[PDB]
Design a protein around this ligand. Sequence first.
Ligand SMILES: [K+]
Ligand SMILES: [Zn+2]
Length: 238
Amino acid sequence: GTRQSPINIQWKDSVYDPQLAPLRVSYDAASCRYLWNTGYAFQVEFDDSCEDSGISGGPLGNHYRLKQFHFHWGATDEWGSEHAVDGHTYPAELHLVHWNSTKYENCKKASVGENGLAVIGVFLKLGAHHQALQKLVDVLPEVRHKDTQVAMGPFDPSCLMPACRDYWTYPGSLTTPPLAESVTWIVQKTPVEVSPSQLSMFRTLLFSGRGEEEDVMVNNYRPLQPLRDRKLRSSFRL
Ligand SMILES: [K+]
Ligand SMILES: [Zn+2]
């Protein structure tokens, strides 16, 4: 593929696009359903029945419905994020996945189709405790094994995003099989602070299933891929 993700977001390749319309983010917290261990990461699933929960504007042709969000992290605080910024890797990265409900019938089909997905990437860095994230951390002990799940109460994913919403956008792909190049990436420039214990709890999950030899879930990120001739745009002046 020539549009693979993640990438090292570099100043030299960035071009400011002042024409980008305001990115509108509005989720229905009441649509949250459960959290589960996918065998690769932990993920929060939503009921994407309504079309009033997701994002629009920015580099998107229309509204994309929120389906789920998940995290990627490392064995220690020194690495873990998928994308890098001018060579710098963060301890973890949050991915909010939305699908094109205008061009596609459902997430599944949109996930492998052109312009099927819009994924927001958020970097997590060490700092102050993050209250919203803690609601998720609290139940991680319930989903240690692969495929296990736990019910979720309402949860607004916007609470996991930085106040400053500057972002970079580029056409990319999924970072897990089938690695389809169906994603319009929106990577937030401003990392979000989380306490040391929150990242430590991420590392208590397992890749392995119940009754199997424990295989610790860490370093669940894909290595950096070349930008190639892709257009990397910034929503903010460089
Ligand atoms: K399950
Ligand atoms: Zn991801």
